[PDB]
Amino acid sequence: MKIHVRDSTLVRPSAATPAVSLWNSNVDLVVPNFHTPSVYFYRPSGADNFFDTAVMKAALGRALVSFYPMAGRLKRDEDGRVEIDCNAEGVLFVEAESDGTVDDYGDFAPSLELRRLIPAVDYSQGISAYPLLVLQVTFFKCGGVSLGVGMQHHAADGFSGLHFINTWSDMARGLDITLPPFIDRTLLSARDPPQPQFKHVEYQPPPAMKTYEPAETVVSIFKLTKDQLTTLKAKSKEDGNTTTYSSYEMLSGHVWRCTCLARGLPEEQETKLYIATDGRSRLQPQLPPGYFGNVIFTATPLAVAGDLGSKPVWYAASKIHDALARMDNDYLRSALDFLELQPDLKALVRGAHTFRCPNLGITSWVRLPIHDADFGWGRPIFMGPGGIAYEGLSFVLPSPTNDGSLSVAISLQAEHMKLFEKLLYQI
Numbered sequence: 001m002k003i004h005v006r007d008s009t010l011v012r013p014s015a016a017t018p019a020v021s022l023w024n025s026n027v028d029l030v031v032p033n034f035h036t037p038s039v040y041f042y043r044p045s046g047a048d049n050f051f052d053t054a055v056m057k058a059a060l061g062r063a064l065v066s067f068y069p070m071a072g073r074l075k076r077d078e079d080g081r082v083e084i085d086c087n088a089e090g091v092l093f094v095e096a097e098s099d100g101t102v103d104d105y106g107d108f109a110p111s112l113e114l115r116r117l118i119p120a121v122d123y124s125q126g127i128s129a130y131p132l133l134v135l136q137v138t139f140f141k142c143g144g145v146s147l148g149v150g151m152q153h154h155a156a157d158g159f160s161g162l163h164f165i166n167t168w169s170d171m172a173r174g175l176d177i178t179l180p181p182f183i184d185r186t187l188l189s190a191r192d193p194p195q196p197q198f199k200h201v202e203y204q205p206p207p208a209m210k211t212y213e214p215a216e217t218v219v220s221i222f223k224l225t226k227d228q229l230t231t232l233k234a235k236s237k238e239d240g241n242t243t244t245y246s247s248y249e250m251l252s253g254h255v256w257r258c259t260c261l262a263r264g265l266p267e268e269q270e271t272k273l274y275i276a277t278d279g280r281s282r283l284q285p286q287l288p289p290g291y292f293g294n295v296i297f298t299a300t301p302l303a304v305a306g307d308l309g310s311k312p313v314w315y316a317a318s319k320i321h322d323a324l325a326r327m328d329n330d331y332l333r334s335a336l337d338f339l340e341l342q343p344d345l346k347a348l349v350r351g352a353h354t355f356r357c358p359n360l361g362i363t364s365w366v367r368l369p370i371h372d373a374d375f376g377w378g379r380p381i382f383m384g385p386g387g388i389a390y391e392g393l394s395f396v397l398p399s400p401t402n403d404g405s406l407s408v409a410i411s412l413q414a415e416h417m418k419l420f421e422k423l424l425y426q427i
Contacts, residue, residue: 001100003116003138007053010090010131014061017068021077022084025188026339027279027294028154029082030348035121035134035150036161037386039114041102044143045377051137051145053095056375059172060135064091066177067164067292069155074127082127082154094119094136102144109221110395110409112387118148133164147373148386157294158368159278165373172375182288188295194337197330202298203338203348206359207270215357215413217391222424224251226404232427238312245317249324252362253316255394255408255424260305262412262420263357267306274350274361275299275320277327284329297332299323305358355392357413364396371400384409 044050064071072086096117105113119134134150151161160181167177224232233250236243245253256273265271279295280287287295301323308316339345355361370383385395394410412420 001098001104001113001116003096003098006095006097008092008094008119009057011057011060011064011093012088012090013064013068013071014058015065017065017071017088018086019088020086021075022069022072022086022183023185024081024083024154025185025293026190026336026345027188027296028185029345030339031153031157031294032349033123033127033153033346035118035152036158037115037118038149038151038161039110039117039382039384039386040147040149040373040380041105041108041382042145042147042377042380043102047377050143050377051139051375053093053137055172056137057093059375060091060093060168062171063164063168063177064088066167066181069183069292070133070164072132072155073130074132074152074154076127084132084155085128090131092119092131092134094134096136096138098138098140101140101142102146103142107221108382108384109219110384110386110388111219114148114384114386117146118150118386121150147380150386153294156292157278157296158365159280159295160292162368162370163290163292166369169373169375179290181290181292183292185293187287187291188293188336190336190340191333194340195334196338196341197334198338200335200338201302202274202300202335203342206272206354207302209269209357212356215391217411218414218417219388219409219411220417220421221397221407221409222421223399223405223407224424224427228425228427229404229406232313235312235427236314236317238314241312241314243314243318245314245321248364248366249317249320250313251396251406251408252320252364253318254313254427255362255396255410256303256320256360257308257313257316258420258423259360259392259394259410259412260308260358261423262416264416264419265305265358267304267309269305269358271303271305271308271358271360273301273303273320273359274354275301275324276361276363277324279327279332282328283332297327297335299327352390355390357392359392361393362396363394366396366398366406368398370398
């Protein structure tokens with residue numbers, strides 16, 4: 001596929017905004033130095049102004065008035081802590097055309113081909129050189145469009161990112177803002193003095209394999225029907241168990257169990273699962289609605305591969321449930337204090353090393369309004385991560401339709417992926 005840039009421009013807020021330095025909490029700092037990628041695809045609606053970029057950019061400028069740190073730059077304070085200079089220098093907006101088609105992406109498995117639909121960022125010129133948000137509208141030969149989004153993680157987590165994109169699309173459709181963002185991350189300050197309660201399992205080194213060989217990773221995506229999910233949830237009754245687990249818990253346990261078997265892990269091999277969890281739900285007092293920043297904490301259940309394999313899915317689901325249950329306000333506040341006492345927070349950012357065999361990360365977007373980004377020409381037919389970076393990461397994506405199906409997108413070694421698919425459908 002050939003992609004050709006027609007125009008690129010910095011879009012600034014359409015009205016005055018505060019000229020301030022925005023503090024980053026410890027949760028805003030334990031994030032990649034990258035732009036988190038996501039992509040939206042849209043089919044032609046028949047309209048004559050399909051994804052008119054003037055409509056797009058005007059609505060973007062309005063949205064940036066309320067989300068003004070999105071238009072800022074990173075800088076460091078005197079002590080070297082990264083903060084957001086809310087200088088309204090603007091967001092990058094790229095209009096692109098492609099000699100390919102939306103059909104060329106098939107089932108939209110989030111391979112690294114999607115990265116071409118998001119603007120590239122040069123990280124070699126220091127942290128202030130690039131915008132915090134980079135956007136690309138690509139016009140395909142077939143008439144379809146992709147919106148590619150690259151969001152610098154210090155500014156916001158997925159929840160705030162979605163808040164922004166859906167606000168933007170509302171404004172493109174002529175609406176006013178539904179949920180004003182709340183901008184003040186000092187609500188997530190550590191206690192003084194920091195008083196950690198635990199040696200937080202989520203920042204400890206994961207189990208290892210004892211040998212490594214090299215592995216290319218493939219990315220696939222698999223749909224599970226409503227019927228299949230219902231059947232899966234009902235397996236909680238297996239072996240006379242009477243505790244019920246949620247569909248989320250049962251599916252994540254199922255994926256975990258399937259990954260272990262697909263990878264042929266030895267029976268005694270330990271495995272750690274990393275589950276992102278939104279603290280907005282648990283922190284006390286309630287964070288204001290529309291809180292703008294990062295509030296993602298990690299639940300990390302542990303198991304033995306042989307036990308996951310030889311026991312019902314609800315065994316894995318129970319581990320997941322317990323690991324999530326313990327993350328109440330006290331535990332989240334503990335984690336903030338734990339971070340405060342770390343000497344180097346970027347050392348805690350998880351990479352490919354974290355999610356290699358035997359471990360796994362599962363991110364669920366099933367609860368989230370990811371398809372509400374209707375800019376006036378319809379909801380997307382697909383929304384996903386813009387390329388799963390490495391082996392051992394998975395995303396659970398709700399259907400764009402109301403058929404109650406979902407998709408598991410996952411990155412595995414190629415020899416593992418085929419067994420994985422077979423096991424996933426043994427419901």
